[PDB]
Design a protein around this ligand. Structure first.
Ligand SMILES: [Cl-]
Ligand SMILES: [Cl-]
Ligand SMILES: [Cl-]
Ligand code: NA
Length: 129
């Protein structure tokens, strides 16, 4: 599923991401825009052989099991394919564990390089929430 900007903001708010660990809703929408272009089916392979999955591009090296990343962890206790669903629940629940691990949203390279220090409120402007 390819979400609209306000559609995704509303789904993320309903799932508890507004101000989660201090990160306003616009930070999460900006991250998803630049990680996946709002597409739940996005995948990208990394140089180390791991793969990133879904709307927030969660990495199989640490967070999910895809059967093809030797010696990886599965810290969210899910198959990576669960992160490509049109229902964003699994991706949101896993992102909450990531953002809590000490490094905040710096775990998402595109957030660090394209959202951090910008006016992220613009990503929810006009939306009914
Ligand atoms: Cl915001
Ligand atoms: Cl594996
Ligand atoms: Cl933080
Ligand atoms: Na893994």
């Amino acid at each position: 599923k390819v979400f609209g900007r306000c559609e995704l903001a509303a789904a993320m708010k309903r799932h508890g991401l507004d101000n989660y660990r201090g990160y306003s809703l616009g930070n999460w929408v900006c991250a998803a825009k630049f990680e996946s272009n709002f597409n739940t089916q996005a995948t990208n392979r990394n140089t180390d052989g791991s793969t990133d999955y879904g709307i927030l591009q969660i990495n199989s090296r640490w967070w999910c099991n895809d059967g093809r990343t030797p010696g990886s962890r599965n810290l969210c206790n899910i198959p990576c394919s669960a992160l490509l669903s049109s229902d964003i629940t699994a991706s949101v629940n896993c992102a909450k564990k990531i953002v809590s691990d000490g490094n905040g949203m710096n775990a998402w390279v595109a957030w660090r390089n394209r959202c951090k220090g910008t006016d992220v409120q613009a990503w929810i402007r006009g939306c009914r929430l």
